[PDB]
A paper describes a structure:
Specifically, AAC(3)-IIIa and its fellow isozymes catalyze the transfer of an acetyl group of acetyl-CoA to the 3 position of the aminoglycoside’s canonical 2-deoxystreptamine (DOS) ring. Here, we present three crystal structures of AAC(3)-IIIa isozyme (isoA) from Pseudomonas aeruginosa in complex with 4,5- disubstituted neomycin and 4,6-disubstituted sisomicin and gentamicin. The substrate promiscuity of isoA is due to its tripartite active site, which can accommodate a variety of aminosugar ring attachments, this architecture was first described in APH(3’)-IIIa and subsequently found in isoB. The isoA crystalizes as a homodimer, with four molecules in the asymmetric unit.
Our structures of isoA bound to sisomicin and gentamicin are also allowing us to outline this enzyme’s specificity towards 4,6-disubstituted aminoglycosides. For sisomicin, the prime ring binds to three water molecules which can coordinate the sidechain of D170 and backbone ketone of G213. Unlike the double-prime ring for neomycin, sisomicin’s double prime ring is stabilized by a mix of water-mediated and direct interactions. D72 can form direct interactions with the 4″ hydroxyl and 3″ amine, while it is also responsible for a water-mediated interaction with the 3″ amine. A second water molecule mediates interactions between O-6″ and D211 and T212. Sisomicin interacts with one final water molecule at the N-3 position of the central ring, which is coordinated by the backbone atoms of D170 and I172. The catalytic efficiency demonstrates that while sisomicin and kanamycin are both 4,6-disubstuted antibiotics, they are the most and least efficiently converted substrates, respectively. Based on our crystal structures, we can deduce that the N-1 HABA substituent introduces a steric clash that prevents these aminoglycosides from binding to isoA. It is predicted that hydroxyethyl chain on plazomicin’s 6’ position would be able to be accommodated, as homologous 6’ amine of sisomicin is solvent exposed.
Author numbering:
A (entry chain C), C (entry chain A): 6 to 265
B (entry chain B), D (entry chain D): 6 to 266
């Protein structure tokens, strides 16, 4: 029997999902196992557990962001500058490695999408506009970001068979933490401005690799080991539910004590 | 006979105010009628309907802003430059014509205040810091303003016996709208910088008079006439509740269709 | 006798015109009086005093710009939108009020014309391409204008019997000056884009009326009174030669001290 | 015994320096040897050979540009962002490796200085304003730069005892040349905007190291070998005089023949 909508709603509630929460999801469709109706039902079941008074958010980003063009031969870079489409929030596809579920939520009715191409988040529910509003282009995991707002409203992160190393929220802890040295990246990206394509430079902390000798999986496992979060099964998947505020506080302290 | 806290909470909920909303208030104490406990109870009842996870904001401005000193004679202007106090967000009083309720909210526990003196907004609640953060000095009703943020987070405007012409949000619609004519003003203002008084010049669109042949009352009356918002009584006052995003969109289209490209 | 080429050259040199200068001209043919060979000889004599290493520029604009159509009834506005020709820099005639000399210079061999229709400038000589390049559509008397470049390369303005109120350079001073009140206008204009007519909206400061209680005649006469420029006769005309940088600096200070 | 103004003027003229030319100088004071009156007289003799109808330019840059702060510990970077002064063109000192002569010219009467901090050029003479005008912040050795204008007005470059590897003009050839790959740098810099310090990001091609397996010394030596320029002694210094237009054309073809795609 493929997992049903009802069995998923009930499992989310059993794990601790409650009406009105703001929740960021990381998931693996394959870890959940076959669902009756496909991955839509994972999203709908989670939405139903949250009710319309709650909010569901995922990290979408942009699968085709051409942030790498300075490494290309100059003549090819020039073609990119002429021919590559800009980030259009209506069409820019989600990063495939963020789960097909992120692309499914990005194209969900009543979705809101944040404006930072590389860090773009999508949300559905009562606080979806709030979470995705005024997402600054520079330092997209920092103070002017959906992650800051998720912490401020005491939201949650649900890991649904997704590896612990993929928690995007810990990039916000990296932004906050006073560390010996953090790597800054400056990269090009085409956006829409007054309906026309414009290439801009985006400045951010590196989010492709850690700033020092740590991993997100290590921080998350240490968090679990000292009693943080709840754990349970949802479909076939091992699931973890974390409070965003407590996990961010823990991770900032973890980073500053080891690398400050 | 005076309106009670409970009856005000019920009236706000009947109008459509819900837990967690971000709400900007324009109000007349006299229009509401006598409240048991005074105007504090209007603010508290509204906060209670919003809950601490909602947010209540008002336009405070600065009652004593000396933005007029350029039209004084040189000798008097010199006295102002020397003697007028700077905008101190801890003490600068709210504009009296913004209702005593704005000054009451400005002095409420856990209030946050935006840094633009002339355009200063005050808020209490979960998004109060968010709404009031990084309020740019120039174009204070524009893209870096609490009004832009109220629109972005899909907040609301509540008119509680206040004239429709007083909706500050429509200055943000003026900022957004592409119009054949705009008046740009530069005016002086004393502020605090590194703990010291410094006189600066602020640039903004004129918000004292319209940029063309319209009024805010007209726009708002037209919005209501085509079904915008909800209406209901709160105390003795006729109240209107508007979605900030829908009203701004309507007002921008209204201005652009009449004066636009 | 009509004035000769040789006597005009001598008069220009006596006034202070030197080889290699970049010069913007405002002129009245009638004030100069009849010239042997007509107004062509005024331009050629000036070009000869400047030599090919100098540059001569004038304000052309567009005599037929339909910037007034938004105020017409819909039915007439519609006809303008469909039937009025776009700004074609090869054919768009200079504003007649700018002197026939501006249209004569616009049609001179080796002329360069700037792309802003309402603010269009025409130039012949060594820096003609430099002065007329990349003239932005918005704020056409501003930072991206031939007037800004004339100031930046320390060019000159020659008034050849033209009223001081007609100095276009003082609109650049208005743009630069920090003033208590500015009128900003948006108006329609047909242009060519990829060889097709397209209607665009242009944003600019109002240049039809001052922004406050002043006139250009007032500013320039004050400049002359404090020793600015040199004066002399050219033909029958009273002529004034101003340094573009010094006049702009003076006018900005004049505006800011009174309205800033 | 020390070299005199008159002998320096003649030595410059012997190379081909003429009245009215626009000339960019690279120099070593030590290579020239002691001059009667010091390095001022080198500049004045060159100016006198060029006459007031000519123009003299040097690369000043900014000795204290804090373009390296991202490599510092975060806490030290934070101090720089707060405390390091911005580029003020009235005071920012010339890079010392560009010769004390560049700082001497930067402080010369009637000097003009271009606005790009890292690439800042200083010039005195008839076309000094033109050469230094509207120097773009990004790609400061490219199309909107003093080097582009020096090429356009058919100016010259004089190497006065300076190593051929230090010719700034060849960074403009690097900018122009269609090469297989050029390294792009983006770096921070504090500037003045409306009288206040602002930190901005500057984008440019790398000018600290070549983009491929070449050196400027090698290009210039090849230019000389095929008959380009003139050479002679000025004081104790070996001098080279290059036409900017011909050298830029030669260098672009040189780079594209060897490293193009
Ligand atoms: C990388 C990772 C997503 C891979 O997980 P996964 O289960 O293999 O991949 P997805 O969740 O995208 O599911 C894909 C499956 O959905 C299924 N599916 C069901 N209906 C589908 C449909 N209409 N269209 C496409 N796929 C569909 C398919 O079986 C597909 O697998 P297939 O192409 O092999 O046939 C996962 O291990 C992970 O890391 N999750 C966390 C990711 C994250 O949040 N990163 C944030 C960056 S900070
Ligand atoms: C102008 C306007 C405020 C007048 O409304 P109002 O009801 O007369 O005035 P207020 O709301 O300030 O209420 C004043 C009353 O509060 C009462 N009050 C109760 N307790 C009070 C107290 N401790 N202290 C002071 N006043 C008190 C008083 O009776 C006072 O009236 P009084 O001084 O005549 O005795 C109203 O018509 C209006 O325009 N509101 C919208 C304004 C706005 O929001 N503008 C935004 C700018 S875009
Ligand atoms: C308005 C102003 C141009 C009128 O000056 P003017 O001397 O009367 O007019 P012009 O310079 O255009 O000269 C016109 C004369 O050129 C003569 N002329 C000679 N050859 C001519 C020819 N081939 N074709 C046409 N006219 C010719 C004609 O006699 C003509 O006069 P007419 O039409 O009455 O017979 C002048 O007073 C002025 O203000 N100049 C400054 C304008 C300016 O620079 N504005 C900038 C905008 S900010
Ligand atoms: C690096 C380089 C400048 C060093 O040359 P240099 O002759 O040693 O140095 P300078 O030209 O700065 O001259 C310094 C000498 O000027 C002399 N001098 C005379 N008057 C002086 C004065 N008032 N103040 C300071 N120094 C003075 C001093 O002897 C000083 O040397 P010292 O400090 O050892 O006593 C030279 O080899 C070079 O590379 N020139 C090319 C520069 C260039 O254009 N770079 C741009 C790269 S694109
Ligand atoms: C398209 N260009 C890319 C650019 O979008 C950006 O992507 C980041 C991505 O790698 C991060 O995932 C890595 O890190 C984590 C935790 N250590 C585990 C999985 C790893 N893959 C992700 N959490 C956040 C993304 N912003 O940085 C890298 C890049 C190559 O430049
Ligand atoms: C202290 N100096 C003043 C300065 O603060 C500013 O005040 C503005 C105020 O008038 C506006 O209220 C007018 O607008 C209409 C709506 N059309 C409703 C009532 C009208 N009075 C208000 N909505 C916004 C304020 N920023 O401009 C004017 C000024 C005199 O300079
Ligand atoms: C075609 N439509 C017109 C549009 O081109 C623009 O014309 C301007 C023109 O009037 C200005 O001349 C006035 O200014 C004073 C200087 N105080 C001298 C003479 C006055 N006539 C001129 N200097 C600059 C022009 N850009 O504005 C007005 C307009 C009607 O909209
Ligand atoms: C302050 N930071 C520095 C920044 O100003 C910039 O300096 C450049 C400078 O090195 C170049 O000189 C090198 O190259 C040449 C020919 N290959 C020979 C001498 C070499 N030293 C000079 N020609 C142009 C300068 N723009 O780049 C490097 C930097 C460290 O980032």
């Amino acid at each position: 029997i493929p997992h049903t909508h009802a069995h998923l709603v009930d499992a989310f509630q059993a794990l601790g999902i409650r009406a009105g929460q703001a929740l960021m999801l990381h998931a693996s469709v394959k870890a959940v196992g076959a669902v009756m109706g496909g991955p839509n039902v994972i999203l709908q079941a989670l939405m139903d557990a949250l009710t319309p008074d709650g909010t569901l958010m995922m990290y979408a980003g942009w699968q085709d962001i051409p942030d790498f063009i300075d490494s290309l031969p100059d003549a090819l870079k020039a073609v990119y500058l002429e021919q590559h489409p800009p980030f259009d929030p209506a069409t820019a596809r989600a990063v495939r490695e963020n789960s097909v579920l992120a692309e499914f939520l990005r194209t969900w009715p009543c979705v809101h999408r944040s404006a930072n191409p590389e860090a773009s988040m999508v949300a559905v529910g009562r606080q979806a506009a709030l979470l995705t509003a005024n997402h600054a282009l520079d330092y997209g995991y920092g103070v002017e970001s959906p992650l800051a707002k998720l912490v401020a409203i005491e939201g949650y992160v649900l890991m649904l068979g997704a590896p612990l190393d993929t928690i995007t929220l810990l990039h916000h802890a990296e932004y906050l933490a006073k560390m010996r040295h953090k790597n800054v990246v400056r990269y090009p990206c085409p956006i829409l401005r007054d309906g026309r394509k414009v290439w801009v430079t985006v400045e951010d902390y590196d989010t492709g690799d850690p700033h020092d000798d740590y991993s997100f999986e290590q921080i998350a496992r240490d968090y679990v080991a000292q009693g943080g979060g709840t754990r349970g099964k949802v479909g076939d998947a091992d699931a973890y539910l974390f409070a965003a505020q407590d996990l961010t506080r823990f991770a900032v302290q973890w980073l500053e004590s080891r690398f400050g």
